[PDB]
């Protein structure tokens, strides 16, 4: 009865994981355009304001590749509310 | 030898079991009809996303759609 | 020792250096070093005499802290380069740590205090292993990383060792410690050429092994830990007096014997690289090493020390023979010089 | 992390200064020695964790497994010493002079 | 209302423990043909308040202890952990959800050993030091048999989450797959409380153990923490081996049936105290090192195969 | 807070400074058991539930406990008042503050910002330590074998030393 | 290494996991998997002495994918600037700081 | 300046429905709206940059809302009873809402 | 957090109960109240060399779900066995014996 | 007789179900009438957070599809 049952928990997981397969496109699309909306919106707050003294170039990627550096948690929410930094940096460890 | 096991089963009736199940578990996998599936039921789980390959027309098997008759169809895991 | 234990230990003392040499993932090189530390300690206390426990407890603490420092270098590298292994980019301090640490396990220079003392409290046999099959491991790690280590430090540890080894040896009369001191010295030459031509380190080691292994099996044939003890060699076993004479002068650099080649080519390589400052001072005090070697020569061969009456009793009884290795390693060592070109 | 990684490193150096400056009891040393292994274990685990380098997590533990036995050997030497002298003071370990 | 949860999580276990002091005196009594407390309350329901409100008023004599720092940190460590191993307990709804839950329960359980070590060492006495060294030997030796039983079993529910054990048991109790584990678990939960046929420490006839020099409060806490994890290590058996009903609706039934089986396993320990002469310190070990540990290691090897050959590898999550 | 780790890091140094002043053999064991608790916490901070708990399970109660154990058996002769040490320790408590202070004014800095959990998949599973430690059985099965021999020949090394 | 009993025997017990770009479990690429590749397919066939000068672009980048310090200096500087201006009110917490601004999926 | 698309550009009608309903209508969202979602991935894994496939992203955010829009007209009430029980759980298991599943599947086997 | 709150509350309760214990009460020689257990030390490092054993056996829960299941099985069995043979040697050595 | 040990258990029999029923209703009342969702793996959190973003600041609140 532990043979025949744990097999089923597997088949329920496949049912439960393939659901997750169908929704990677929607989430990865939202996640791309969201984080790609944070740092134009943070590029602004850095450029629109906060930067009128000399020798500063807004959006000075520090790498040379020009490939897409997946933004770091810090750069993504850091200059934003103290709450956001934790909710991104300690939201899961703190539970559920 | 066979009657030495008889006192070792009367007195010391523990190590017998511990060297009778230590081993039993080494032979059950090598001789079972269903041991093949453990590396397969554990191979089917799509934990990460299956990246689709670009079409060239040179790939007949690759099932074009999730519901095509083609591809890894597990009517096995069902009623395994 | 339950022969099973003997096997497990000996296997570890032998798997220890071999894992170090074979692996490239430094981590696996560290555990190779760690095993060697664990395997050697049981053998060191085999007599379990009060001197022995002291020996092992020192050897272990010296070995353990160095092992921890080597691990720290690997841990630091992991954060300066994701790799688990030293690379061109490695921070200089990261490598220097590895030099100091590894120079402690090998016991070179200002960390040369543990070796003479552990060589004094362990048996002649385990003395050999502690001196020669435990130097292979750390040296491997250094030889692998030679392109990256500092020429300055190595040289300082090299020169220091040569001096400490020589000076220490002059005063010592206990043989085990005379050898411990020699090993410090030879170990010094070896680490001098590492930055320039590692391949010569591997010659200055083998020759040291082919010289020291016969020398110790000689000391134990009569199990003499005293020069006075080796001096009565003429009565206990007269034949080994001839080769003991040449091997010890070979250990020092005198020209006809095999021992000159390691010093000669190391000097040739250092002059090729322009260290004619360093090489000169090393060769000069290297000459101090021969003085204490010849002082022993005097006592054991060139002059016959007086013996006790009971020595006649030990002559009567058949002397258990010296293994064949003695011969094959005495000759290949005392006289191969005519074949130097192919050795290098 | 860069900030913290410093604290752990100095912890290892403070533990380094400890094991290289004995005082009476040896068990103190061995204990200190262990303080390093903890600092190394913590640092290895920390960087592996923020490099998302899961292929390397095996190491943080291999470090502990080898370090534990290493310490086992160390303590057996210690017990051997306070069986031959019964006071475990680094002070009496000087016969080899 | 998270604080409402702790207040309704620690009050209803310090108020339960208290009436285990009572129930450990009556059930033992009627087996001894002797009524327990009947007088201070209706049927002894009001006796623990007396010696609660009494022990705390007796002089906490720091008897020339080597170090108070320990004398007063050991007893607090205990009740601190014991009342913490309840935080991740897998009720139909656990106070806190902790993947690695079962490890948490294992780890915290271990720290307890210190209380024995520290208390014994601080209070300068032969008995104290003697008992401690001997006692922890037992405790530690039994961790190695608990862990494996703990590990082995895991392969079956397939995760370290207490909260999944309930699902794994959605249709059966794990007592039937693993009664060998559950036997040795029972002794590893009955002898890791320094309790029962196994009370070597606090050997009373032979040793007067560590808590000997403790009195009044410092004692009460040590005690309170032996009866607040006399209910844990039975509460786990009512989770890991005896699986009560769990329905998305009616989420109490589980707690109710959790009750019915935890009291038996908490009332099953009480038959033991009143039934078995104590094991001698040598025998206890030989029970674990030369009998249980072998069977435990082999059966662990058996359980790693069972999934593979039965293809029953449990679902992560 | 954001200085969730720093503070802890600072506590880890304090515990190491305590072990470094070499306090009485068992009073300092506590010290280790303290910083081991502290190091257990930091790793948890970064998401290493397994790796973290592991330390709290093995070094904390396994190694350390056995350590003091032996202290009691020997080298707990409990013959400088640790209080003197605590006095010095207090000095270091703030002396380290001095070391940090210079770099404090120099200033990363201002506590701890996003200098933890650099990159984490905002979607996805199987991302969790213990999946990496379980590479001992797939793709890193040599670390597992050599650890075995350590412990295995450890038995034989210990008994031989003991005997 | 010193004695390559591994290449000879063909076994790979110690090489499969030496760099961050090695096979990570469940194909979970680590941070920088992009760079280290670019910095070791570059230095392949070119020895170190010449993996240290011309293949310096890829290490200078990989030294900042992982240390990620030049970033700090940028961000830390930015931080200070905000502080000074803000103190004189020259700069105001952005709408982002004010929250809202339509936090979206 | 590193290219960072204009916020205006990023604007797209969005799904804005809680995870529970997505988990209910997911297996049908894999059947339908697949050609429009896999091509996003096929750009996403080939072209490793979220600043280039935003094209197909707006398509994914489009076909999905299409999927539901039909379900909202067609067979909405039995869909509401389905996820309304499924979201009651703590991990949203199909294992419980198994009767609500066929009642929604037969309603959607016939229609659409 | 919650876990912090709880564990911290659990401490405060412990401390209070000893606070009240040493204060509620508010001389006489009332206060007035060894060889090595080599066996014990052995038992102790036997436990160290075994606790680390568990630490290398805890991955099983997450390795059972590895593709190379056949490999895991093999790797595990050896560990459990080599450790049993160690215990067994101890048995013969009589180290286990008290 | 033995009738009397029951008064005692009765309290340890409610003192032990007060916790299991309590924790399992202070969850269904501090999570909007629905079990407290369990975030065991990154993907569960994301979904949970996403929900908060979709409606109110509370995960618990849910958008039926009219949103
Ligand atoms: C042989 O070892 C033993 C003893 O020592 C010799 C005993 O005295 C005893 C007898 C001891 C007792 C009857 C219990 C001692 C005192 C207690 C009742 C401890 C419980 C005290 C409490 C404060 C419980 C109340 C809980 C709260 C804090 C209220 C929460 C709201 C036993 C059973 C024993 O095993
Ligand atoms: C419900 C179960 C758990 C209950 C936990 C709490 C239980 C306690 C409830 C409140 C009790 C409050 C009084 C406690 C005892 C106070 C001290 C006392 O009685 O006097 C002794 C103390 C000390 O006794 P003493 O001064 O006579 O000295 C006794 C002899 N020697 C010195 C050896 C100890 O007397 C006082 O100093 C005055 C105390 C006044 C207390 C306030 C009224
Ligand atoms: C490049 C030249 C280097 C130098 C070469 C010349 C020196 C050789 C080394 C000599 C070193 C030892 C000097 C002192 C020896 C003392 C020997 C002695 O005391 O006699 C006893 C000894 C053993 O006795 P046993 O053979 O058992 O029987 C007699 C028992 N009373 O009796 C014996 O040992 C007998 C055997 C002695 C060894 C014979 C060696 C003969 C000389 C070798 C010369 C080689 C020249 C090579 C030239 C190369 C040119 C390119
Ligand atoms: C791989 C194994 C995995 C599990 C390993 C578990 C630990 C193995 C320990 C082996 C111990 C060997 C040994 O030395 O045993 C000695 C034993 C007597 O020792 P002891 O128990 O101290 O006696 C005192 C009694 N008061 O005397 C004995 O040896 C008794 C041995 C009895 C069992 C021997 C083997 C029986 C195998 C039966 C297999 C099935 C047969 C059908
Ligand atoms: C140039 C390079 C210079 C490097 C430093 C060289 C220092 C001088 C070396 C020779 C000093 C003279 C010999 C005697 C030294 C000595 O006795 O101190 C040992 C020290 C104290 O402990 P103990 O061994 O009991 O000595 C008591 C003596 N009545 O034992 C210890 O200190 C044990 C460790 C505890 C103290 C350090 C703990 C770490 C934190 C250090 C903070 C800064 C402390 C600065 C001092
Ligand atoms: C003086 C008297 C004696 C004083 C000392 C008494 C003993 C104190 C220790 C008692 C036992 C504590 C045992 C703690 C073990 C570690 C707990 C842990 O690792 O789990 C924390 C958990 C980890 O994350 P995860 O498992 O993923 O959570 C599930 C949802 N993801 O999620 C978290 O990370 C939560 C945040 C970390 C909490 C870790 C435990 C903190 C304990 C703090 C104690 C002090 C309280 C504040 C002061």
Structure characteristics:
part of a larger assembly, 10 chains, C: 344 residues, mainly alpha, 18 helices, I: 98 residues, Methane Monooxygenase Hydroxylase, Chain G, domain 1, 0% strand, flat, binds Ubiquinone-9, binds 1,2-diacyl-SN-glycero-3-phosphocholine, binds 1,2-Distearoyl-sn-glycerophosphoethanolamine, NADH-ubiquinone oxidoreductase chain 2 (chain C)
Q: Explain this structure to me?
A:
The structure is cut from a larger assembly and holds ten protein chains of ten kinds. Chain B is mainly α and 80 residues long. Chain B has four helices and no strands. In chain C, helix 5 (114-121) runs antiparallel to helix 6 and helix 5 runs antiparallel to helix 9. Chain C has one domain. By secondary structure, chain C is mainly alpha-helical. Chain D is mostly helical. Chain D has three helices and no strands. The longest helix of chain D is centred in the last third of the chain and has 27 residues, at 58-84. Chain E has 13 helices and no strands. The longest helix of chain E is centred in the middle third of the chain and has 32 residues, at 126-157. The two termini of chain E are 28 Å apart. Classes of the chains: A mainly alpha (96), B mainly alpha (80), C mainly alpha (344), D mainly alpha (97), E mainly alpha (317), F mainly alpha (163), G mainly alpha (105), H mainly alpha (112), I mainly alpha (98), J mainly alpha (67). At the D-F interface, helix 1, helix 2 and helix 3 of D face helix 1, helix 2, helix 3 and helix 5 of F. Bound molecules: Ubiquinone-9 (UQ9), 1,2-diacyl-SN-glycero-3-phosphocholine and 1,2-Distearoyl-sn-glycerophosphoethanolamine (4 copies). Residues 238-239, 241-242, 245-246, 256, 301 of chain C line the site of one 1,2-Distearoyl-sn-glycerophosphoethanolamine. Chain D: It catalyses: a ubiquinone + NADH + 5 H(+)(in) = a ubiquinol + NAD(+) + 4 H(+)(out). Chain D: It comes from Mus musculus. Chain D: One of its GO terms (molecular function) is NADH dehydrogenase (ubiquinone) activity.
What is the approximate shape of chain I? flat
> Can you write the helix and strand succession of chain B as a string?
HHHH
Distance between the termini of chain I: 46 Å
The dominant shape of chain B is: rod-shaped
Task: Name the assembly state.
Answer: part of a larger assembly
Beginning-to-end CA distance, first to last residue of chain B: 42 Å
Order of helices and strands of chain I: HHHH
Total strand segments of chain I: 0
Count of separate DSSP helical elements of chain B: 4
Q: What's the main sheet of chain I like?
A: none
* CATH class category of chain I: Mainly Alpha
Rg measurement of chain B, Å: 24 Å
* Main sheet makeup of chain B: none
Main location (chain E): mitochondrion
Protein name (chain E): NADH-ubiquinone oxidoreductase chain 1
GO molecular function (chain E): NADH dehydrogenase (ubiquinone) activity
Subunit structure (chain E): Core subunit of respiratory chain NADH dehydrogenase (Complex I) which is composed of 45 different subunits.
């Amino acid at each position: 009865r532990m043979m025949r049952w744990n097999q089923e928990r597997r088949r329920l997981l496949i049912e439960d994981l393939e659901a997750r397969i169908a929704l990677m496109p929607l989430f990865q699309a939202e996640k791309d355009r969201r984080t790609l909306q944070i740092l134009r919106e943070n590029l602004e707050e850095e450029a629109i304001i906060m930067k009128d003294v000399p020798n500063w170039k807004v959006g000075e990627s520090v790498f040379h590749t020009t490939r897409w550096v997946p933004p770091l948690i810090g750069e993504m929410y850091g200059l934003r509310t103290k709450e956001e930094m934790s909710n991104a940096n300690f939201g899961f460890t703190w539970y559920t | 030898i066979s009657a030495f096991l008889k006192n070792a089963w009367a007195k010391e009736p523990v190590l017998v079991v511990s060297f009778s199940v230590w081993g039993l578990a080494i032979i059950m996998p090598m001789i079972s009809p269903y041991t093949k599936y453990a590396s397969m039921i554990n191979k089917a789980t799509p934990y990460n996303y299956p990246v689709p390959v670009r079409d060239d027309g040179n790939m007949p098997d690759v099932p074009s759609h999730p519901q095509d008759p083609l591809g890894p169809s597990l009517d096995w895991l069902k009623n395994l | 020792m339950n022969p099973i234990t003997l096997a497990i230990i000996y296997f570890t003392i032998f798997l220890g250096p071999v894992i170090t040499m074979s692996s490239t993932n430094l981590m696996l090189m560290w555990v190779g070093l760690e095993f060697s530390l664990l395997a050697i300690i049981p053998m060191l206390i085999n007599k379990k005499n009060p001197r022995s426990t002291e020996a092992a407890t020192k050897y272990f603490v010296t070995q353990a802290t160095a092992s921890m420092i080597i691990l720290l270098a690997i841990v630091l590298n992991y954060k300066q380069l994701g790799t688990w292994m030293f690379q061109q980019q490695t921070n200089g301090l990261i490598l220097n740590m590895t030099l100091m640490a590894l120079s402690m396990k090998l016991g070179l220079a200002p960390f040369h205090f543990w070796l003479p003392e552990v060589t004094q409290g362990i048996p002649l046999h385990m003395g050999l292993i502690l001196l020669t099959w435990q130097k292979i491991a750390p040296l491997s790690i250094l030889i692998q990383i030679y392109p990256l280590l500092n020429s300055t430090i190595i040289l300082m540890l090299a020169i220091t060792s040569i001096f400490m080894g020589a000076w220490g040896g002059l005063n010592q009369t206990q043989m085990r410690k005379i050898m411990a001191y020699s090993s410090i010295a030879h170990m010094g030459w070896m680490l001098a050429i590492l930055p320039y031509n590692p391949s010569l380190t591997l010659l200055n080691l083998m020759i040291y092994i082919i010289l020291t292994a016969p020398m110790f099996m000689a000391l134990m044939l009569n199990n003499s830990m005293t020069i006075n003890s080796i001096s009565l060699l003429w009565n206990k076993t007269p034949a080994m007096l001839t080769m003991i004479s040449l091997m010890l002068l070979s250990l020092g650099g005198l020209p006809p014997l095999t021992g000159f080649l390691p010093k000669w080519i190391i000097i040739t390589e250092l002059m090729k690289n322009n260290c004619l400052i360093m090489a000169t001072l090393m060769a000069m005090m290297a000459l101090l090493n021969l003085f204490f070697y010849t002082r022993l020569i005097y006592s054991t061969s060139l002059t016959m020390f007086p013996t006790n009456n009971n020595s006649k009793m030990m002559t009567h009884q058949t002397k258990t023979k010296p293994n064949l290795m003695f011969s094959t390693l005495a000759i290949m060592s005392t006289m191969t010089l005519p074949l130097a070109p192919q050795l290098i | 992390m860069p900030s913290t990684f410093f604290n752990l490193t100095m912890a290892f150096s403070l533990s380094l200064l400890g094991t290289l400056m004995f005082r009476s009891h040896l068990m103190s040393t061995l204990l200190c020695l262990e303080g390093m292994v903890l600092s190394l274990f913590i640092m290895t685990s920390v960087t592996s964790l923020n490099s998302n380098s899961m292929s390397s997590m095996p190491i943080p533990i291999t470090i502990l497994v080898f370090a534990a036995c290493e310490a086992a050997v160390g303590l057996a030497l210690l017990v051997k010493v306070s069986n031959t002298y019964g006071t475990d003071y680094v002070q009496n370990l000087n016969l080899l002079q | 209302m998270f604080f409402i949860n702790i207040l309704t999580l620690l009050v209803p276990i310090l108020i339960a423990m208290a009436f285990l002091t009572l129930v450990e005196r009556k059930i033992l009594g009627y087996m001894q043909l002797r009524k327990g407390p009947n007088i201070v309350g209706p049927y002894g329901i009001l006796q623990p308040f007396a010696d609660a409100m009494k022990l705390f008023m007796k002089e906490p004599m720091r008897p020339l202890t080597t170090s108070m720092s320990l004398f007063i940190i050991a007893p607090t460590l205990s009740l601190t952990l014991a009342l913490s191993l309840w935080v991740p307990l897998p009720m139909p709804h656990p106070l806190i959800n902790l993947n690695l839950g079962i490890l948490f329960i294992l780890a915290t359980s271990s720290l307890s050993v210190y209380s024995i070590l520290w208390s014994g060492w601080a209070s300068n006495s032969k008995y104290s030091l003697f008992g401690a060294l001997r006692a922890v030997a037992q405790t530690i030796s039994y961790e190695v048999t608990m862990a494996i039983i703990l590990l082995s079993v895991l392969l079956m529910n397939g995760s370290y989450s207490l909260q999944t054990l309930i699902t794994t048991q959605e249709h059966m109790w794990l007592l039937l797959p693993a009664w060998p584990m559950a036997m040795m678990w029972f002794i590893s939960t009955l002898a890791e409380t320094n309790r029962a046929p196994f009370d070597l420490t606090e050997g009373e006839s032979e040793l007067v153990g560590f808590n000997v020099e403790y009195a009044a409060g410092p004692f009460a806490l040590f005690f309170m923490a032996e009866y607040t994890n006399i209910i844990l290590m039975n509460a786990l058996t009512t989770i890991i081996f005896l699986g009560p009903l769990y329905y998305i609706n009616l989420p109490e039934l589980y707690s109710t049936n959790f009750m019915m089986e935890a009291l038996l396993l908490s009332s099953t320990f009480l038959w033991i105290r009143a039934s078995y002469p104590r094991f001698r310190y040598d025998q206890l070990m030989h029970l674990l090192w030369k009998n249980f540990l072998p069977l435990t290691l082999a059966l662990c090897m058996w359980h790693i195969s069972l999934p593979i050959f039965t293809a029953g590898v449990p679902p992560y999550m | 807070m954001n200085n969730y780790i720093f503070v802890l890091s600072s506590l880890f140094l304090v515990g190491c400074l305590g072990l470094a002043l070499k306090p009485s053999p068992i009073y300092g064991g506590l010290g280790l058991i303290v910083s081991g608790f502290v190091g257990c916490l930091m790793v948890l901070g970064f998401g290493g539930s397994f790796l973290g708990l592991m330390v709290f399970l093995i070094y904390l109660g396994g190694m350390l406990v056995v350590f003091g154990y032996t202290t009691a058996m020997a080298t707990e002769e409990y013959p400088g008042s640790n209080w003197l040490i605590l006095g010095f320790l207090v000095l270091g408590v703030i002396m380290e503050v001095f070391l940090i202070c210079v770099l404090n004014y120099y200033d990363l800095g201002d506590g701890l910002g996003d200098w933890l959990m650099y990159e984490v998949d905002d979607v996805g599973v199987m991302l969790e330590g213990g999946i990496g430690v379980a590479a001992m059985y797939s793709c890193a099965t040599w670390m597992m074998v050599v650890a075995g021999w350590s412990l295995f020949a450890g038995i034989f090394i210990i008994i031989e030393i003991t005997r | 290494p010193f004695l390559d009993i591994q290449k000879k025997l063909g076994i790979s017990l110690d090489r499969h996991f030496m760099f961050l770009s090695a096979e990570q479990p469940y194909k979970n690429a680590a941070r920088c998997h992009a760079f280290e590749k670019e910095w070791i397919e570059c230095a392949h066939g070119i020895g170190g002495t010449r993996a240290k000068k011309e293949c310096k672009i890829e290490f200078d980048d990989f030294e900042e994918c992982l240390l990620r310090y030049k970033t700090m200096r940028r961000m830390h500087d930015i931080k200070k600037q905000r502080e000074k201006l803000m103190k004189e009110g020259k700069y105001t917490p952005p709408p982002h700081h004010s929250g809202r601004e339509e936090p979206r999926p | 300046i590193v290219e960072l698309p204009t916020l205006e550009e990023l604007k797209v009608e969005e799904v804005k429905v809680s995870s529970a309903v997505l988990k209910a209508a997911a297996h049908h969202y894999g059947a339908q709206c697949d050609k429009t979602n896999k091509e996003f991935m096929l750009c996403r894994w080939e072209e490793k940059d979220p600043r280039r496939c935003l094209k197909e992203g707006k398509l994914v955010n489009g076909c999905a809302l299409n999927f539901f829009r039909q379900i909202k007209s067609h067979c909405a009430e039995p869909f509401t009873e389905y996820w309304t029980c499924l979201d009651y759980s703590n991990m949203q298991l199909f294992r419980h809402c198994r009767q609500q599943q066929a009642k929604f599947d037969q309603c959607v086997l016939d229609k659409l | 957090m919650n876990l912090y709150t709880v564990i911290f509350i659990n401490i405060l309760l412990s401390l209070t109960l000893i606070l009240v214990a040493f204060w509620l009460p508010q001389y006489s020689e009332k206060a007035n109240p060894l060889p090595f257990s080599m066996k014990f030390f052995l038992v102790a490092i036997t436990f160290l060399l075994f606790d680390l054993e568990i630490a290398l056996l805890l991955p099983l829960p997450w390795a059972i779900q590895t593709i190379k299941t056949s490999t895991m099985m093999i790797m595990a069995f050896i560990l459990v066995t080599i450790l049993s043979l160690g215990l067994a040697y101890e048995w013969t050595q009589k180290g286990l014996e008290w | 007789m033995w009738f009397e040990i029951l008064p005692g258990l009765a309290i340890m029999g409610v003192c032990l179900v007060i916790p299991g029923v309590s924790t399992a209703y202070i969850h269904k009342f501090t999570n909007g009438g629905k079990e407290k969702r369990v975030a065991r793996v990154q993907y569960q959190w994301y979904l949970m957070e996403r929900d908060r973003r979709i409606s109110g600041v509370n995960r618990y609140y849910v958008s039926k599809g009219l949103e």
